[PDB]
Ligand binder design. Structure first.
Ligand SMILES: O=P(O)(O)O[C@H]1[C@H](OP(=O)(O)O)[C@@H](OP(=O)(O)O)[C@H](OP(=O)(O)O)[C@@H](OP(=O)(O)O)[C@H]1OP(=O)(O)O
Ligand SMILES: O=P(O)(O)O[C@H]1[C@H](OP(=O)(O)O)[C@@H](OP(=O)(O)O)[C@H](OP(=O)(O)O)[C@@H](OP(=O)(O)O)[C@H]1OP(=O)(O)O
Ligand SMILES: O=P(O)(O)O[C@H]1[C@H](OP(=O)(O)O)[C@@H](OP(=O)(O)O)[C@H](OP(=O)(O)O)[C@@H](OP(=O)(O)O)[C@H]1OP(=O)(O)O
Ligand SMILES: O=P(O)(O)O[C@H]1[C@H](OP(=O)(O)O)[C@@H](OP(=O)(O)O)[C@H](OP(=O)(O)O)[C@@H](OP(=O)(O)O)[C@H]1OP(=O)(O)O
Ligand SMILES: O=P(O)(O)O[C@H]1[C@H](OP(=O)(O)O)[C@@H](OP(=O)(O)O)[C@H](OP(=O)(O)O)[C@@H](OP(=O)(O)O)[C@H]1OP(=O)(O)O
Ligand SMILES: O=P(O)(O)O[C@H]1[C@H](OP(=O)(O)O)[C@@H](OP(=O)(O)O)[C@H](OP(=O)(O)O)[C@@H](OP(=O)(O)O)[C@H]1OP(=O)(O)O
Lengths: 337, 337, 337
């Protein structure tokens, strides 16, 4: 339908046409909206609308102490009333539709979301956390004041969360494929591991099929085989820290004897619902009263923000040392609607 | 009876007449006590008594790193032995009673608690926290040394926690009453919410009766009604952060159809016992092996400290947008004994 | 057997003769090992081996913000290939054994662990923590690069955790024995507590026998008796903080009437398995996929590090005030193999 929220006193309502604004890499969907204000209520006050992209990292108690990392990556402030020159660019048919039903006390606003900006990512809070979640969020905020500097008023202000999202590219990428050979010393023996995925791109909730082939031309015994999907979150503040969290694991007592080959497909699905306990897991941005998913793969630089990526790991568990592994990068994304 | 505690080696005991010292706004009950020392034990050492009002904010691991906020808001140091001039002001009948039963090795001490000081508030720790709790505490400390600068000794020192408390004013304040009207666009329609409490002041454990009246002269349908009590903790460090935590909620699928009125009382009771899981909730100061309650409303400025306050929220849940709300400030306090 | 681990790509393996290196107080077992490299893989790159003793304190989110305390207490960097002069000192019979089976692409390395260094201690993480644990750890790291400054590569590098450990001295120390007398005012009454352990040194998992004797020549009634073992962790960063955590408790409603004596042995055993919930408890260093124990007593200065020590507390619970206590230091250590 149309998305709208009011101030607590109801003197102020913001309408938007949607909450998700798609990053097309060359450009982003612009935010076209309308603020409706009560006339006699603001009086000499002005109506401002603000678009903020904010990046916060740190627990709630670090907020009070001024220790958490809080940076606005993007701020645009718009004086919507008293009305201003019309560009940019026209009014969209949604604004026109809304300015008619609401009348002269409705006022359009327009923002472009800069492309060089992270997408909406929520870092999953633990059950104890009570503040707002760490990550990158976007917020449309409308309020009434004499000037931008005047402090905030809760009763007058509407805060509205929106999201910058990306969708799977249309061009299929190259097939993920990796291999690792453990050579053994003087003898010509070796323990060979090959693995691959059918494709580079998977959709949330779609099972990955991991092709595993083991050539054990050695005297060691593979005693377990472990297949996992790991999330990689690059947190870029002053220094970029990379956090890894497994989000799916199949572990079987499959054995590969000496002088033997082994070939199987392992099917595995990364789901947020098996990971609601992992603090700090990257989630696609938290919306109102909706459910989210594991954060989509970022389509790219180490500017401030959060970059998310995924890999399959296949590990051959050998006794003592001797373990063998490959990793398979893939992409995890929603399909374009 | 009389409150007393000894050092671990028992060479030193502090007696006080009570643990709660009442803030009367114009003044505070003074701390009149006695320290009993073993004569031959201190020898050339002096006996000091200290009254400290301390304000700490931050988890335990931040202590070690020097990151937590720790400020003594008030320190008074008293050399009780070798004895000193008698004022102020006399000895109280409690000190006289105690100096008789204990004799020449008992020594009085006297402190005034400055009024411009927060009251005792404990921030509720999570099950994981193991240090002392954040908040504002008062401590009488007695110990033996050559001078005040000499470092602390656990075996010699007695630490005794006391509380600065407030009680409900005698004059009833004005009846809490609020209203919010959602006007609808061009049509003369409206969705009106009125609410009130019988009184401004409630006692811990006393039920609040929330009078709710809804006039739905609109086409929208109230589908749920939500009544809650929220604690508001103003944490004033360098910047004042306000934390909110609900501590009671009634949520019913009560509906208010278009062109209809609705009138009901909702009864709701904020109890700590339904909130033992909420980390950082403001509690009246933690005493020894006793149970506490939700922190009392502060009777007032943004000096360093913790200010606590309470509100009822009444929310009419309407589909899509359209929600309507009022808030009702009230005071929550113990009655004066 | 022999301990070995490879890089993820298997081009690089580090062998060591053991993982625990014993601090003999006058000196430490040296780390004698071998790195095996694939010849054509490194090409123009060099092989380095690093011995690092690291000290980290702080939760995971403080890492990203640069707030945690991270200090390398000791770093030694060794260019093992292209080979270098032979001392020190010879090659051990383990290196010789290994250089034969592996051949010319195996290269010895040798490190002395400085004595003035803490032992391996892990601070017990909570279930929520996901990073590496706080405490003091030692790590052998081998990798391929042109120079030491070149950044790290995960596929090339092997990381291997080792431990600096201590064992119980051979000379028995003096018997722990303490006493505390509560004298009562004017009357010649008194409440006397004596306690002792059979010995100063106990082994992990060995029960302590606490000899308790109470002479109640007073009018007060001991109503409970509490015996506990407490861990004391001195965390020495910029300022040394001492953290205490009980790790065993016997609490009985044993009573000692006025004009009565009382004599009993209380047996108590500190076990990690009854304390897996205590965040920050000092543990002997966490090895790979093994189980650990409560940290051993440190055999000593307040340099940077973690010092661990233990005491029995015996407390006589008297009504109102009047409690009486002693503490008994003891040592808790593994026997030398
Ligand atoms: O606006 P936020 O700071 O995100 O806080 C909101 C807000 O609480 P306030 O009344 O303090 O503004 C909601 O109220 P509305 O503005 O929506 O009326 C409230 O109520 P709802 O549940 O009805 O949305 C909701 O509380 P809850 O925890 O029950 O969701 C709560 O959310 P947070 O405090 O959790 O952000
Ligand atoms: O212990 P593992 O890692 O499984 O490997 C060992 C190792 O052989 P590698 O050189 O391949 O590690 C032993 O070699 P030594 O160091 O003992 O010389 C060898 O002993 P032999 O050389 O006498 O064969 C032993 O065999 P085992 O432990 O069964 O006696 C063999 O394990 P596998 O030969 O079973 O692989
Ligand atoms: O004095 P605090 O620093 O607040 O610590 C006390 C104190 O422990 P110490 O023995 O280290 O001083 C109590 O001992 P007393 O001074 O009262 O003899 C002890 O024992 P009680 O339980 O008998 O009071 C209690 O331990 P517990 O955790 O069992 O209450 C503990 O409290 P905290 O360490 O939790 O503050
Ligand atoms: O979707 P809601 O927020 O419940 O309100 C809508 C909205 O009316 P408002 O202007 O009061 O929001 C629609 O207006 P349009 O934007 O679609 O013009 C209206 O449609 P009509 O104008 O055709 O009546 C629709 O009615 P419905 O969704 O039942 O077709 C009506 O809901 P109510 O009229 O039931 O309040
Ligand atoms: O090397 P670390 O940084 O300590 O991390 C390791 C490592 O994960 P990577 O694949 O990211 O290096 C292990 O892999 P190997 O180097 O041993 O192949 C992995 O797998 P294992 O379980 O097979 O040891 C293990 O994951 P797990 O959590 O399952 O132990 C994990 O440990 P941490 O991330 O917990 O340190
Ligand atoms: O309350 P407790 O700490 O158990 O000790 C009290 C206290 O005696 P102490 O001086 O030893 O503390 C009372 O002394 P007063 O301050 O009341 O003078 C005394 O009262 P009497 O002096 O009248 O004996 C009272 O006795 P009770 O409370 O049973 O009347 C006695 O407790 P015990 O005498 O039982 O130890």
């Amino acid at each position: 339908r149309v998305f709208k929220k009011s101030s607590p006193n109801c003197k102020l309502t913001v309408y938007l046409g949607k909450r998700d604004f798609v990053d097309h890499l060359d450009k982003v969907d612009p935010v076209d909206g309308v603020v409706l204000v009560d006339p006699d209520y603001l009086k000499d006050r002005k109506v401002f609308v603000t678009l903020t992209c904010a990046f916060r990292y740190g627990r709630e108690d670090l907020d009070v102490l001024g220790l958490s990392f809080r940076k606005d990556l993007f701020i645009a402030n718009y004086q919507a009333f008293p009305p201003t020159p019309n560009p940019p660019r026209p009014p969209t048919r949604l604004q026109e539709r809304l300015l008619r039903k609401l009348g002269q006390h409705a006022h359009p606003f327009f923002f472009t979301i800069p492309q060089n900006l992270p997408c909406s990512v929520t870092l999953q809070p633990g059950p104890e956390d009570t503040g707002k979640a760490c990550g990158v969020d976007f917020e449309i905020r409308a309020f009434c004041a004499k000037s931008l500097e005047e402090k905030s008023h809760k009763r007058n202000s509407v805060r509205l969360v929106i999201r910058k999202v990306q969708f799977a590219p249309e061009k299929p990428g190259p097939q993920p494929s990796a291999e690792t050979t453990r050579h053994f010393l003087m003898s010509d023996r070796s323990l060979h591991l090959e693995a691959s995925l059918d494709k580079e791109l998977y959709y949330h909730g779609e099972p990955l099929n991991v092709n595993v082939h083991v050539t054990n031309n050695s005297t060691k015994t593979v005693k377990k085989i472990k297949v996992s999907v790991r999330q990689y979150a690059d947190i870029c503040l002053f220094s970029t820290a990379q956090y890894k969290c497994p989000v799916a694991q199949v572990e079987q007592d499959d054995q590969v004897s000496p002088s033997s080959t082994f070939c199987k497909v392992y099917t595995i699905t990364p789901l947020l619902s098996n990971n609601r306990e992992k603090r700090g897991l990257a989630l696609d941005g938290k919306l109102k009263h909706e459910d989210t998913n594991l954060a989509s793969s970022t389509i790219v630089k180490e500017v401030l923000g959060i970059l998310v990526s995924y890999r399959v790991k296949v590990k051959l568990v050998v006794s003592r040392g001797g373990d063998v592994s490959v990793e398979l990068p893939f992409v995890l994304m929603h399909p374009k609607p």
